[PDB]
């Protein structure tokens, strides 16, 4: 039952085992991000969510494919 450990795992120091990267700062606004594979804090994905690298719109559309078609069949039907 791994679900009994998530509470610790989320609260575990350096929850994420990070692939070694360079664009992610060691410390951002008085807060450690990575453990210089290396480990990373829980706030790193949220940091990437706003101050991370972007990609092509076509790549995004390809990645989100096979998940939208249900959305525009659910929102284009009459009940």
């Amino acid at each position: 039952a791994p679900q009994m450990r998530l509470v610790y795992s989320v609260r575990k120091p350096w929850p994420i085992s990070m692939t070694p990267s360079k664009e992610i700062p060691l410390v951002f606004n008085g807060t450690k991000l990575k453990d210089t594979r290396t480990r990373a804090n829980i706030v790193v994905p949220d940091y990437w969510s706003k101050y991370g690298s972007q990609t092509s719109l076509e790549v995004v559309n390809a990645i989100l494919y096979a998940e939208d078609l249900k959305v525009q069949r659910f929102f284009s039907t009459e009940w």
Binding site: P2, V10, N29, A40, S49, T55, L57, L64, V71, F75
Partner: protein, 577 residues
């Protein structure tokens, strides 16, 4: 209890779902399993004869017995050879397409099966390290041992593994690599040894049970025979594996007739069966359909191995001098299991006739299905493990009496022994019970043994949310849950999901969003939920950009393939840590 029994505006059948100890700690077993294992072993030897004589039944190597010796007022262990032959022939008379399809299986793609997928098995006990190890490393160790003893590479096909085992066990002296040596007697003892273990997360009865697991060198045979059981059970209408209960209860009998329902369980379903009757069943069916002699050996070896089982006796019985407590193995000091002392083989014990949990759950069902097939038994029967339901259609009550009596006798013939106190018969049909499904009039009520977890699985936020949503969807589709229950469950799951990822209250992550001027945009981040009751199969990032709650810039930021961290219909994302 009177609170659980309504009389107006609703019937007790629907509220019988309340007769379940949900949201409570499931019992967990402590200490030694020796007493339970010894009781499991000793029960079949105490029911072979009408008069209880354990010692006389210890030398019995075959559960073949006589009708006069069968106990009709209590449990009876054993079988009648001619009865098994006739019942197997009767079952062979009907259900021709299923037998034709298993012939297709055996002659087309049964050898196509491999041994790599056996890695998907349950925990094993390695016979070299003498330790409980997972299935994959056990399989690698087994194939390494086979290739270093057989002097040739093991083919991918499972039949290659079977021939490899058959050839390697004839090499007398064997060694693994350390340099752990073995002998022929040691290999046979490892074949005979069964690994008992407490059943965890078991609900439904006061007394705990012990489940067995076999060695990895016999799991191939047991899984191929279980597979044959599967593709003979999937295409017979009287099996318990599919909606069979609903379609069977959809019968509309004519008024000038009486239809009744029996719902029953089994007392000692794994302490009254001899593998020899199973052998005879398999051999008769396979011979009458046209299997060769090598198929005979291939499908009869697992029972050869099981008839000499050496299930471990846990860690020993419990003895107290004063306030002290010690675990003394059987035979060191006299106890209530002295009769089995002569059967003690080291840390194991010999048990020629018997059964254990976790071995054969579908071929026992096949034995029940062949048993129910008679001439006067003009009813419809559904079987699943230790539970059964039968529907009798006839004209007069005494016909019901004789049919049910001969059904009970026929089940006792092979050693099934349906529970006298757990079989309930109602002579007018309409309200039945089977497995976890009830039936009142025409409506059927599915009840889940376990409530939905309503908690993230722990892998990562989006996958856990997807699994929870899929679990809720599965629960509501089966009828176990409805609109209000589904919405309440998804609200509870949302609360647990938010709490588990520091999306509630004030914490380090919340301070991270606050100081960095990062407003929440996702459910795990702390934003308002977007999933509705009808949105069970919709993705997390979906329905957010469609409603305008997400901007494409942050979507490019998170959905960037060049991100340091990267059925589950979850889109890859940066938060999939």
């Amino acid at each position: 209890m009177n609170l659980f029994t309504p009389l107006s505006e609703i019937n007790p059948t629907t509220t019988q779902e309340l007769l379940y100890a949900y949201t409570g700690p499931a019992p967990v077993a402590y200490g030694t399993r020796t007493r339970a294992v010894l009781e499991n072993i000793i029960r079949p030897y105490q029911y072979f004869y009408k008069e209880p004589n354990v010692q006389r039944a210890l030398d019995i190597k075959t559960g073949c017995k006589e009708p006069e010796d069968i106990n009709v007022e209590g449990p009876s262990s054993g079988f009648h050879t001619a009865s098994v032959l006739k019942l197997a022939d009767n079952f062979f008379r009907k259900y021709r397409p299923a037998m034709e399809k298993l012939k297709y299986w055996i002659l087309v793609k049964l050898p196509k099966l491999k041994y790599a997928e056996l890695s998907k098995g349950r925990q094993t006990y390695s016979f070299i390290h003498k330790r409980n190890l997972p299935a994959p490393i056990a399989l690698e160790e087994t194939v390494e041992f086979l290739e270093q003893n057989l002097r040739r590479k093991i083919g991918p096909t499972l039949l290659s593994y079977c021939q490899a085992i058959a050839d390697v066990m004839e090499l007398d002296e064997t060694t693994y690599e350390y340099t752990i040596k073995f002998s022929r007697e040691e290999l046979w003892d490892q074949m005979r040894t069964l690994n008992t273990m407490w059943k965890h997360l078991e609900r439904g009865r006061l007394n705990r049970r012990t489940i067995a697991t076999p060695s990895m060198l016999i799991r191939g045979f047991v899984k191929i025979v279980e597979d044959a059981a599967k593709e003979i059970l999937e295409n017979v209408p009287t099996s318990g594996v599919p909606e069979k209960l609903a379609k069977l209860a959809s019968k509309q009998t004519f008024h000038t007739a009486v239809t009744g329902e029996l719902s029953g369980d089994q007392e000692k379903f794994n302490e009254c069966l001899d593998p020899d009757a199973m052998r005879l069943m398999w051999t008769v069916f396979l011979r009458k359909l046209g299997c060769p002699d090598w198929i005979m050996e291939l499908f009869n070896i697992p029972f050869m191995v099981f008839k000499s089982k050496l299930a471990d006796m846990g860690e020993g019985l419990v003895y107290t001098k004063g306030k002290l407590t010690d675990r003394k193995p059987l035979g060191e000091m006299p106890s209530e299991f002295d009769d089995l002392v002569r059967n003690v083989v080291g840390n194991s014990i010999s048990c020629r006739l018997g059964m254990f949990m976790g071995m054969y759950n579908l071929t026992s069902t096949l034995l029940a299905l062949i048993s129910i097939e008679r001439e006067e038994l003009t009813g419809s029967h559904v079987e699943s493990s230790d539970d059964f339901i039968h529907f009798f259609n006839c004209k007069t009550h005494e016909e019901m009496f004789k049919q049910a009596e001969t059904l009970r006798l026929t089940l006792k013939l092979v050693g099934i022994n349906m529970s006298p106190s757990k079989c309930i018969l109602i002579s007018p049909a309409g309200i039945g019970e089977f497995n976890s499904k009830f039936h009142h009039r025409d409506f059927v009520g599915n009840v889940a043994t376990e409530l939905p977890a309503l908690v993230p699985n722990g892998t990562n936020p989006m996958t856990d949310l997807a699994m929870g949503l899929n679990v809720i969807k599965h629960s509501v589709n089966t009828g176990q849950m409805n609109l209000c229950t589904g919405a309440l469950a998804m609200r509870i799951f949302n609360h647990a999901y938010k709490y588990a990822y520091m999306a509630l209250g004030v914490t380090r992550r919340t301070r991270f969003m606050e100081e960095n001027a990062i407003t929440p945009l996702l459910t795990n981040q702390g934003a308002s939920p977007v999933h509705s009751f009808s949105t069970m199969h919709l993705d997390e990032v979906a329905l957010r950009r469609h409603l305008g709650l997400l901007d494409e810039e942050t979507l490019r930021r998170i959905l960037n393939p060049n991100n340091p961290v990267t059925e589950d219909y979850s889109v890859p994302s940066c938060f999939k840590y």
